[PDB]
């Protein structure tokens, strides 16, 4: 950073734990460990100004591994559809909703 | 100095103990035959699953089977 007394001294008191893909205790990988990796091994050697346009696929994905919002919109839409159809009985609670269907190990 | 501890053991007989056990606990680990095992008995516990490595034939030690004579055998933790 402003004064890199850490790299110089070789110590790493503040770097080992800055991202979700850092070593998690007992090797319990966090959500998205896959993406963030893919989005920081990409932006390594390429500065930010160019980690912001071409390495946009990996952030657009990592922005949806963690926010997980585009999913919501899908699911929420699906939800509404069911509702309308169901009200007119167009759609019926699936066998799953009816339960059973052989819940298995 | 040695006879100053004698009133501090007669009167004030608390802080003596608190600075005699504060420390005792700093020297017991550095001088005990069994302090090595605490980072080892705590290192043996397989909390998560041991992922097996693919065989190449270039690995003699890696014990092929759970019951091979090879590998981390703890006849130590037993009767530690």
């Amino acid at each position: 950073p402003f004064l890199d007394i850490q790299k110089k001294l070789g110590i790493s008191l503040d770097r080992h734990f800055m991202f979700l893909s850092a070593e998690q205790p007992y090797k319990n990988a966090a959500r998205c460990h896959a993406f963030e990796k893919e989005w920081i091994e990409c932006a390594h050697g390429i500065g930010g100004t160019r980690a912001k346009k071409e390495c946009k696929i990996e952030f657009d994905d990592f922005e949806e591994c963690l926010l997980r919002y585009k999913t919501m919109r899908r699911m929420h839409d699906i939800k509404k559809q069911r509702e309308k159809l169901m009200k007119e009985g167009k759609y019926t609670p699936p066998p799953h909703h009816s339960g059973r269907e052989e819940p298995r190990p | 100095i040695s006879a100053f501890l004698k009133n501090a053991w007669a009167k004030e007989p608390v802080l003596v103990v608190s600075f005699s056990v504060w420390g005792l606990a700093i020297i017991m680990p550095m001088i005990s035959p069994y302090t090595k095992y605490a980072s080892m008995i705590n290192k043996a516990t397989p909390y998560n699953y041991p992922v097996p490595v693919r065989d190449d034939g270039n690995m003699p030690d890696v014990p092929s089977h759970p019951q091979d004579p090879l590998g981390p055998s703890l006849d130590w933790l037993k009767n530690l």
Partner: protein
Amino acid sequence: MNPITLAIIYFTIFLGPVITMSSTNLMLMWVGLEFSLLAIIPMLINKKNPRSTEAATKYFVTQATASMIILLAIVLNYKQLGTWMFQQQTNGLILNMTLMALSMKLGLAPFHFWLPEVTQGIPLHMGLILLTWQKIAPLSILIQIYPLLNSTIILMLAITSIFMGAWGGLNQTQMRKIMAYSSIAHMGWMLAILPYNPSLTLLNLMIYIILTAPMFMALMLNNSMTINSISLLWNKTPAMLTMISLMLLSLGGLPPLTGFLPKWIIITELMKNNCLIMATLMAMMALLNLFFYTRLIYSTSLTMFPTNNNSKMMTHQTKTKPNLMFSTLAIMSTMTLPLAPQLI
């Protein structure tokens, strides 16, 4: 102060900025800011005069809420990017918060009200630390994040500060507050070039430190918090009248002295980046700052104000000397201009 306490505090006031600068995990940057807040408050109330408690209670509330806002920015980032640190992707509002917050701790522009008042109730000494070793920390955080901050806001806070600082200074007669106001102004120039060339911020700061540190140790040599008080400098200690004159004109941008370089290269960098609108208005009111600097010049040097008879008594007694730092920081400051190319 039990010398032990003095050490713990001073260490914290010094570990405070240093952790901020060294760390990259923003969190660790926040606690560096937090320590500085905790360490400075004890020293501020050393006299424990009724004015002092007011000073600290203001400084603390202003510092504390800003600290909480900076933490909120870090907490929000943590959810927009798992990282604990600002990145290209950071939501713009996330960064703007950090600018406002950090511009409160540094006291720039529309948040410039606390500084003049705390500079008025603290001793001259703790005044220096509160003005110059407490600006290093927040600025570090900004300079690190410069690529990402907004050019518009900074400029507005920059211009505002320049104006507020200048206008405020014109009326003030208390020295501590004249300096507080100058610092607001210089702090403004510094934050103007941050988005464009951070390296110049670090020059417009050092020069400010090499200018203000001699200026304050001058104010306290005779411990004068009044211009009337500094005006009788000619009787109390005549030699410092010459350099006090040049350092104050150096603090303003007049060309032969070292003080021109920061303004000159900041203007050169802003014109290189095309802000010939902004740069022009800043330079113009920058000229207002020199007016109040020269008004003080008038009272202290160019004209000799009348003195009390007891001043002869203080002359008799040997005057405790000014530390060496005064000289080395007065000359390196009043005249290094011939060596500008290597400074930048």
